[PDB]
Design an enzyme around this catalytic site. Structure first.
Site, PDB file in Angstrom:
ATOM      1  N   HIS A  28      -3.712   6.747  -3.375  1.00 44.45           N
ATOM      2  CA  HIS A  28      -2.350   6.115  -2.134  1.00 44.45           C
ATOM      3  C   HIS A  28      -1.133   6.101  -3.411  1.00 44.45           C
ATOM      4  O   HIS A  28      -1.410   5.587  -5.108  1.00 44.45           O
ATOM      5  CB  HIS A  28      -3.223   4.821  -2.135  1.00 44.45           C
ATOM      6  CG  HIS A  28      -2.453   3.880  -1.643  1.00 44.45           C
ATOM      7  ND1 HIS A  28      -1.116   4.274  -0.418  1.00 44.45           N
ATOM      8  CD2 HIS A  28      -1.977   1.971  -1.491  1.00 44.45           C
ATOM      9  CE1 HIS A  28      -0.695   2.859  -0.238  1.00 44.45           C
ATOM     10  NE2 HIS A  28      -0.896   1.553  -1.296  1.00 44.45           N
ATOM     11  N   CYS A  88       2.171   6.963   3.092  1.00 42.64           N
ATOM     12  CA  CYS A  88       2.635   5.922   1.877  1.00 42.64           C
ATOM     13  C   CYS A  88       3.369   6.256   1.456  1.00 42.64           C
ATOM     14  O   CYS A  88       4.321   5.232   0.685  1.00 42.64           O
ATOM     15  CB  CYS A  88       0.953   5.829   1.056  1.00 42.64           C
ATOM     16  SG  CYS A  88       0.609   7.061   0.279  1.00 42.64           S
ATOM     17  N   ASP A 100       2.497  -2.749  -1.428  1.00 41.99           N
ATOM     18  CA  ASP A 100       1.196  -1.686  -0.741  1.00 41.99           C
ATOM     19  C   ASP A 100       1.955  -1.865   0.775  1.00 41.99           C
ATOM     20  O   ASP A 100       1.064  -3.412   1.218  1.00 41.99           O
ATOM     21  CB  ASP A 100       0.053  -2.737  -2.018  1.00 41.99           C
ATOM     22  CG  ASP A 100      -1.141  -2.122  -1.114  1.00 41.99           C
ATOM     23  OD1 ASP A 100      -1.388  -0.906  -0.335  1.00 41.99           O
ATOM     24  OD2 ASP A 100      -2.045  -2.556  -1.440  1.00 41.99           O
TER      25      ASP A 100
END
Ligand SMILES: [Cl-]
Lengths: 242, 75
Positions: free
Chosen positions: A116, A186, A133
């Site tokens: 990620h 992401c 995030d």
């Protein structure tokens, strides 16, 4: 053709280079390797120490970027007002050295896996640390990360004092999950959030997104198509002038 | 002569090369040590990418120079 592919270290770097041309206070920190959750604080302290040295007219201690001349890097440290600290994360490794081995293994395989991309923005002008995030709590609960970053903010007040006494503050950007509708978007989300922040450092855009996941993902696809067009012909592995 | 190639982990590989070696030949020597295919490698020296079709001497690389190997990292 609404695709959002898993963005790699190279396209993220080119987007940073492009964003510097638009906002010269952004320094396009390299992503080969990026920081990790185990050394982002050290990396930021090393950068701020070098900026203080350039302001005093002294030598830099490094480490130096590999795709920038040393004199251009000194000019960017003089200019910069904002550090875009990309972090690569995987849930299996639990030290810095184990995370670097996991990063090499997945790089050579060409696999995304469970990895990620996170972003920490160091806004030097506002004295603000911003943690983004897209998955909300992929590393840890947000109240835990806020506490870690509040202690780090106290350290930065000693490392990098202002004229006045203003203390660094902490913002957790995502109040719930952002990235819906895809497991691999992401890096694109990080760059879209960074662009919103550059346009407005009080942005509330994360709290104004479409509710259904297929529309929210389509809008990010439009951003991705525009960014890929904008960087395609810009120089490969080469920092812009400060 | 010996040259050094730095990787993303900070570990340094040592290669045995001649100045007339092509950049593609260097990338094959890295494959022998690290198992990375040449098509996945990019090499940097003195702030610039080294291009297939040129030689080490085209960049004035000398004994004990350090190159940087760059890979593409997904997430
Ligand atoms: Cl800058």
């Amino acid at each position: 053709e609404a695709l959002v592919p898993a963005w790699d270290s190279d396209i993220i770097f080119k987007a940073l280079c492009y964003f510097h041309t638009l906002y010269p206070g952004l320094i396009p920190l390299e992503t080969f390797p990026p920081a990790t959750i185990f050394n982002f604080k050290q990396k930021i302290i090393s950068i701020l120490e070098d900026k203080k040295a350039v302001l005093r007219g002294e030598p830099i201690k490094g480490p130096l970027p590999i795709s920038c001349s040393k004199e251009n890097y000194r000019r960017h440290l003089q200019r910069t007002t904002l550090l875009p600290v990309f972090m690569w994360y995987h849930p299996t490794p639990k030290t810095l050295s184990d995370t670097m081995q996991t990063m090499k293994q997945l790089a050579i395989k060409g696999s995304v896996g469970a990895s990620h991309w996170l972003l920490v923005i160091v806004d030097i002008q506002a004295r603000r640390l911003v943690y983004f995030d897209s998955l909300y709590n992929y590393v840890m609960p947000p109240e835990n990360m806020k506490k870690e970053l509040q202690s780090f903010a106290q350290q930065l007040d000693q490392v990098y004092p202002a004229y006045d006494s203003k203390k660094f503050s902490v913002k957790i950007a995502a109040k719930e999950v952002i990235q819906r509708g895809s497991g691999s978007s992401c890096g694109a989300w990080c760059c879209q959030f960074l662009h919103w922040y550059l346009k407005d450092p009080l942005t509330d855009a994360l709290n104004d997104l479409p509710v259904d996941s297929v529309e929210r993902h389509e809008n990010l696809a439009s951003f991705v198509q525009a960014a890929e067009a904008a960087v395609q012909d810009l120089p490969e592995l080469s920092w812009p002038e400060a | 002569m010996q040259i050094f190639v730095k990787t993303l982990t900070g570990k340094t590989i040592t290669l045995e090369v001649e100045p007339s070696d092509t950049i593609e030949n260097v990338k094959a020597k890295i494959q022998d040590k690290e198992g990375i295919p040449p098509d996945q490698q990019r090499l940097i020296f003195a702030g610039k990418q080294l291009e297939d079709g040129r030689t080490l001497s085209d960049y004035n690389i000398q004994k004990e120079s350090t190159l940087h190997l760059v890979l593409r990292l997904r997430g």
